[PDB]
């Protein structure tokens, strides 16, 4: 199930985080004009940069804390107000986040390892909706 999951992603994150990241990159690769820094370089190049593996790895740590402190896969009010007023998340759209939760669903249900994906679409969901309530455009 979702609890599961989350520990399945945390005793490999850095892996998880890497691919899903390129997943969601490359699914849209609007979403690159973001970093701007990730432009003209292919999955191996953004795996051998620096703000690449430690930016990822963040993002993933954090999302698994919001999914672990998350009742029912509803995050908590306060989680999705640390996101809206991340002064490095300022002049994105709830559709940004949207999107990350396709490539990330879409990732696990191509795996064929057994995660609840139901629960990931459903969290994504939940978590786009707690943004939107918190102040996010």
Known sequence: GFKQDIATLRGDLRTYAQDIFLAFLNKYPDEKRNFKNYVGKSDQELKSMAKFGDHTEKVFNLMMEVADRATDCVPLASDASTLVQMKQ???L????FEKLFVALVEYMRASGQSFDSQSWDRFGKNLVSALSSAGMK
Do not use: K, L, Q
């Not at 759209?93 to 940004?96: A, E, F, K, M, V």
């Open 89 to 91: 998340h300022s002049g």
């Open 93 to 96: 759209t709830t559709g940004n």
